[PDB]
């Protein structure tokens, strides 16, 4: 029985999440969680709260038991980017694009 946790509008570039996210993809929940506690990267704490919320809602609510739970998907999508002008030398007025992420976790027993 399946549960979605999302974190939308998250403070990450998405290429740096996907490095970590694809690692624990198809891993089963408990091995995935062990691997994640000792990854220091900003991406790994961002994912932690959303991985736990998924697992935690499986341990309750519409879910029942977690021993046969596995993390079928961990993926990341374009969130709304905010545009800002960075001040710089010889009157250069370039764009810095502040990325956010749409993080989707799915766990199921299925």
């Amino acid at each position: 029985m399946e549960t979605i946790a999302k974190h939308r509008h998250a403070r990450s570039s998405a290429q740096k999440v996907r490095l970590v996210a694809d690692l624990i993809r198809g891993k089963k929940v408990s091995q995935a969680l062990d691997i994640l506690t000792y990854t220091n990267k900003k991406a790994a704490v961002l994912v932690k709260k959303v991985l736990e919320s998924a697992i935690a809602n499986a341990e309750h609510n519409d879910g029942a038991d977690i021993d046969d739970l596995k993390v079928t998907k961990i993926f990341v999508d374009e969130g709304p980017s905010m545009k800002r002008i960075m001040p710089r030398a010889k009157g250069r007025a370039d764009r810095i694009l502040k990325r956010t992420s749409h993080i989707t976790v799915v766990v199921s027993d299925r």
Binding site: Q15, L19, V20, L23, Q31, D34, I35, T37, Y38
Partner: protein, 56 residues
């Protein structure tokens, strides 16, 4: 330099694919605790061959 044309999306994928994050070759848990591990390092509670590390 500069460039000739806007490049294909298959090119972007090849250049970052080998630079992608590499496997841990599974993980460890302790011989000596109900603590989980980090392999050939010492945990936050100091368990590996005891003593103590990270008194934070």
């Amino acid at each position: 330099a500069v460039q000739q044309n806007k490049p294909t999306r298959s090119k972007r994928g090849m250049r970052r694919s080998h630079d992608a994050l590499t496997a841990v070759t599974s993980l460890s848990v302790d011989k000596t605790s109900g603590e989980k591990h980090l392999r050939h390092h010492i945990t936050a509670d100091g368990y590996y061959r005891g003593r103590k590390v990270i008194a934070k």
